[PDB]
Design a protein around this ligand. Structure first.
Ligand code: CER
Ligand code: CER
Lengths: 411, 411
């Protein structure tokens, strides 16, 4: 039996450009939400997002190579490098073959698609960049990373909307467990804060519209929720087989011990009031890990600050935790960070891992007045200190009722 | 140990709207390539593609529901229904939970992205459809199918460019083998024959330009190759665990016995002249199945009719088959059908499965003059009759050097 452990972390996010900085900002209840200034938002109903601030990549990616790449790929690589550096792995010819990648995105290169389409509308097909395809398609984050580090193992990319993050980590472990790889770089990257991504979610009426107080917009479970808050970023994990990691003397952050997937079979964008799909994915993760709900100390919720969405997950937690529902800690870091779509599950896996390290649970800021029936401990305003927390659960749900959960364990 | 078998086939393609029709057209060496007429191609360097002809879906999808869906999703569903109908599975409340889906696409809804972006350019963000997001994102084929049949098992979507098809089948089996599901609907759907998809690949100089003879454009391994030929379509497979399938008395088409993944670590679009990545993926598939190259009767090649691409794969076959390289049959059905990108690996899995059933190997049409060093039996012009063929191998390679292979076995 092969046990997968997390030996390397890397990340870009709205509250920080590194893992540790981001983690301090979350624990200090800082927000990363801000007014969008890279495109005219006058006609838009949402004028704010969680944007990655003062991002440098020149040291890692050259200006000549920057032009073949949408910003989502740029983020993915930089965060991937971080994860590799943190891992300390040395890739040798005797190694290459056993190391792979499992990185996805919800929609990939929206920025460059809009740009190319604009050129085509204004100049015909001869003005379309020669890199249009490889600069936008979702799997190019893993493509460039494999090339960069000479990785020859398995190379997949799962694109399941907001569950992407969780699914890539899940299958990266599965791959390792199966024997196809020893080390896997996994995570997700997203950069949808573009006209079409902001407009598009606006069109569906899914985004918050609180432009008078951008940092208060995102309020999971609060009575005044009006929609999720969009955020860009990327979170990369290095997963590797225990023994392999043991022999090399690797920083072991945690052990990936459970992975559950489920389908809703209800609505294309809406979740069931019930939360049954969310319930069956936690449930399945539990079975896969072989533990009971009661051993879960902290649940990093999907909790996107949407009226219907937050209700459902809460209910699913009450179904799964039952009597231990009052003793379990459930927060949403999306109150600060915003929804990272394809990257959400990746960064939130890092937050659930660090919580094990530090026994501190990031808060759910802006939760001034819980709505009617939410009696759970949502870690309301300030980080909570804890003791003896062995496991944490991490949720992510997505359009098409595609659900996933990851269980982490302290080692 | 769990053995996965294929109990249901479904498919839309340029040469046919059903599985059997398509199969007859391939064996009769028919081409599906034609002049594009849904957009002005006057300024374009390629004016032809493999398009799905006279496609009906009204019986399956209503006109009110058609509007929330890009054509790639439309194709996926219709082909998925076919696969379910062919399977004969009955979904019950005692069943739902164990049946899932694993359907991907290379780029998903290009058609609707261009349309929405056009509206936004000409009318601002209020003219963007409310279904923009769910009508384009890659995972909505599995989303709608799960809802339609009430599937509650695992729901993933792999988006690895032209390897998508193979990867979704691969992981669908892995999932089943692992125990997360008993039945999985898997495959891919693509519909990139749009201005941006044709222009975009044109921009890279990757497409054939033989507009004077569209049906002769696609010529894998021929000396006059000038680029791949674009094709739309979808191919769906129903994978299910042997025992489960046995007990229900299911039509067993074949057994999925091997799945190999590999990374090139060379170039973002170009393959290595060597074909080493392609070699290591066949190699890995072989190990996973536990058989030797010599037992492989037919290889459905990636063979996209690209100068560099076709060279490399051929070499990789010579490395893997070695002495049996002359006795093994290698054809490319892309000579007729064109490249289905995200769907390519799905339809070609069906062609490798049917070849087992009928012991007939589809030809590589248009191969008038093999280039210099290609001495392999490429099944040059007419279908070849065979006897005692137990296994077939199926290849698919993609941008970012992401490789995959599937091995099928006659039962
Ligand atoms: C996210 C959610 N409901 O939690 C949802 O599944 C989703 O739409 C992700 C797909 C988005 C990809 C980025 C595209 C932006 C236009
Ligand atoms: C396909 C190949 N080289 O065999 C290649 O990997 C690829 O570009 C697939 C990605 C395309 C998705 C459809 C987008 C069209 C614009």
């Amino acid at each position: 039996k092969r046990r997968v452990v997390v030996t390397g972390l890397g990340m870009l996010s709205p509250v920080g450009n590194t893992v540790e900085s981001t983690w301090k900002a979350l624990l200090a209840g800082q927000s990363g939400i801000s007014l969008i200034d890279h495109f005219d938002t006058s006609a838009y109903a949402t004028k704010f997002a969680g944007l990655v601030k003062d991002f440098n990549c020149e040291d890692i990616i050259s200006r000549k190579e920057q032009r073949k790449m949408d910003a989502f790929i740029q983020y993915g690589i930089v965060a991937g490098v971080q994860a590799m550096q943190d891992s300390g792995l040395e890739i040798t010819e005797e190694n290459a073959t056993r190391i792979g990648a499992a990185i996805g995105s919800g929609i990939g290169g929206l920025g460059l698609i809009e740009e190319n389409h604009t050129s085509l509308m204004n100049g015909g097909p001869r003005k379309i960049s020669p890199f249009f395809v490889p600069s936008t398609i979702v799997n190019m984050v893993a493509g460039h990373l494999t090339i960069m580090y000479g990785l020859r193992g398995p190379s997949i990319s799962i694109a399941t909307a907001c569950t992407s993050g969780v699914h890539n980590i899940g299958h990266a472990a599965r791959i390792i467990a199966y024997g196809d790889a020893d080390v896997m770089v996994a995570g997700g990257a997203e950069k949808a804060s573009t006209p079409l991504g902001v407009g598009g979610f606006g069109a569906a009426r899914a985004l918050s519209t609180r432009n008078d107080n951008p940092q208060a917009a995102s309020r999971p479970w609060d009575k005044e929720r009006d929609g999720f808050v969009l955020g860009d970023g990327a979170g990369m994990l290095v997963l590797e087989e225990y023994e392999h990691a043991k022999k090399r003397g690797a920083k072991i952050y945690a052990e990936l011990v459970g992975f559950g997937m489920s389908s809703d079979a209800y609505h294309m964008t809406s979740p069931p009031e019930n939360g049954a799909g969310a319930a069956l994915a936690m449930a399945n993760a539990l079975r896969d890990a072989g533990i009971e709900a009661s051993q879960i100390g902290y649940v990093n919720a999907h909790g996107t600050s949407t009226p219907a969405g937050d209700k459902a997950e809460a209910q699913a937690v009450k179904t799964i935790f039952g009597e231990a529902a009052s003793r379990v800690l459930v927060s949403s870091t999306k109150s600060m960070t915003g929804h990272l779509l394809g990257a959400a599950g990746a960064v939130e896996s890092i937050y659930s891992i660090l919580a094990l390290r530090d026994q501190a649970v990031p808060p759910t800021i802006n939760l001034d007045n819980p709505d009617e029936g939410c009696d759970l401990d949502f870690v309301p305003h300030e980080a909570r200190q804890v003791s003896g927390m062995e496991y944490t659960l991490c949720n992510s749900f997505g359009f098409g009722g595609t659900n996933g959960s990851l269980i982490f364990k302290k080692i």
